[PDB]
Amino acid sequence: ALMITDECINCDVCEPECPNGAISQGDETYVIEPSLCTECVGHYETSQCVEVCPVDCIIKDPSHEETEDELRAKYERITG
């Protein structure tokens, strides 16, 4: 899973880009819901939210280290 850090400028651009609806508006920043973030494995070759973030604040979430296989597996439980 990835996480949006405190440097988020609340620009709204990454929200609509997530295939799993993992990103939502927070009180201070946008937040990714880790159970929904597959790091875009299964849909795209790269993270879509990272691709559009204007200030490079989405990074790997150290408390949710998943392999290409667990992301794949997550992609599979979220979609079919």
By CB under 6 A, residue 74 contacts ligand SF4: no
| Rounded distance between C-alpha atoms, residue 32 and residue 55, angstroms | 16
Nearer to ligand SF4, 12 or 68 (CB): 12
| Rounded distance between C-alpha atoms, residue 77 and residue 9, angstroms | 32
Residues within window 25-64 making contact with ligand SF4, judged by CB under 6 A: 30, 32, 37-40, 47-49, 52-55, 57-58
Which residue intervals of 1-80 are DSSP H helices? 48-52, 68-79
Coil vs helix vs strand at 45:
coil
Which residues of the chain form contacts with ligand SF4 (CB under 6 A)? Answer: 2, 4, 8-14, 17-20, 22-23, 30, 32, 37-40, 47-49, 52-55, 57-58
